[PDB]
Design a protein around this ligand. Sequence first.
Ligand SMILES: O=C(c1ccccc1)N1[C@H](c2ccc(OCCN3CCCCC3)cc2)c2ccc(O)cc2CC12CC2
Ligand SMILES: O=C(c1ccccc1)N1[C@H](c2ccc(OCCN3CCCCC3)cc2)c2ccc(O)cc2CC12CC2
Lengths: 221, 215
Amino acid sequence: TADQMVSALLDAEPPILYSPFSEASMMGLLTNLADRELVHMINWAKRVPGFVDLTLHDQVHLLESAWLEILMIGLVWRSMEHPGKLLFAPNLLLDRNQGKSVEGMVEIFDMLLATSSRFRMMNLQGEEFVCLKSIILLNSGVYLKSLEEKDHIHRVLDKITDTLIHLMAKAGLTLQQQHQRLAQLLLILSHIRHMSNKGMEHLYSMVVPSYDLLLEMLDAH
Amino acid sequence: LALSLTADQMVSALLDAEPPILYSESMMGLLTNLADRELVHMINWAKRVPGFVDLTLHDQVHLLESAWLEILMIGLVWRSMEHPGKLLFAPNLLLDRNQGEGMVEIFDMLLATSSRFRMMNLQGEEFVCLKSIILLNSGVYTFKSLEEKDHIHRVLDKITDTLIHLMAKAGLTLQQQHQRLAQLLLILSHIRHMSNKGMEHLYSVPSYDLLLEML
Ligand SMILES: O=C(c1ccccc1)N1[C@H](c2ccc(OCCN3CCCCC3)cc2)c2ccc(O)cc2CC12CC2
Ligand SMILES: O=C(c1ccccc1)N1[C@H](c2ccc(OCCN3CCCCC3)cc2)c2ccc(O)cc2CC12CC2
């Protein structure tokens, strides 16, 4: 049910990781941190309900599409209550002037600040965050076995929608406010997809976990 | 002022605002020429979206800069819906996957979005609602300024109520309503992905002044 869905997602949540400050080592610090987050992200995805029911190959493809989005929404969430700053790590808090070093970095940095500000204006809750995060993992790459795979992903996404509505109903929101907030939340995902693509372009101008690399982390013994 | 229309009145204003289907006049000169001609009718459609002209001209242009490729794509996806395996760019330009460097990637994504619309039985009054959400939402995060974004979010909220009212009219349960709403808005995230990849593939853009003058 929605309550067991929330609890599983709240319990599957990964930990917050840590990184004279040097501007030149910034991209080094940020790369090392994201490489370590990827490991815990693999563990988190395996505990999202319905994810491991999928074949190993579609699990990789799903993670291949969403990994940057997921890193970004977690960054936006960690930065939600520090206006104007991104909290990459508790010991790595940056403002937009520190992003001016790399070319094309401050544009993505401003889009992440607008999203964190948008979460603030919405007063996003942690139970809603883990729901959106899980939706990113299942929806970003979903567009005979593949018919069965896709129908299962959409059934799980259906359960998460009902979970979102249930948290909104438990919060006392009206039925009209429930539809409106759900729409407001899922519309932010289009912008997160947008940032991930701009960030993907920015990473190639200097990088992506390979299929063979993601499969090793997913395929356990 | 425009936030006073009923859900039925909102549907009718969007249905009456739909642009015409244009015709094609080297396969890529025709796609560019087609897209340039569709852009003018898109501006006139955007002006008839309830609440759009209530924004300043500066913010109207910014919304159109962000959403124009998405709106052309969802319109193409809508036209190709009844044509499996092919995209209907124009009634005299019906292309297949084999007619498509970097083009078959985007072509496949459009074909998959069209097929997703088909098995969802996307309706016309639902489609016109999804197109107005793209126009208002695609640029609201990259902008008095706060009054404008409050207005955009108010109108976006009315379309949500409009979409839910259409699903309720059709006999869907409340649970089926939330699930269909979520399903449709999750496809917008993919259209945005195609527009991004399309923009990179085109780079491999209408100016502010041009959009302003067509307005
Ligand atoms: O610096 C930036 C940034 C911020 C603002 C504007 C432009 C860029 N980023 C950081 C990052 C760094 C490298 C990386 O790719 C590394 C290669 N690759 C090699 C092995 C496989 C996986 C990684 C991905 C993300 C990072 C770190 C932690 C975090 O929580 C989130 C992010 C987000 C982000 C994308 C926005
Ligand atoms: O060909 C393609 C295509 C299709 C499949 C795979 C790859 C590419 N496209 C066509 C197009 C062409 C040029 C253009 O940009 C032209 C510059 N021009 C643009 C504004 C003003 C000045 C610059 C935009 C869109 C087009 C036409 C009509 C339509 O309904 C939809 C589309 C869709 C689309 C993006 C997918």
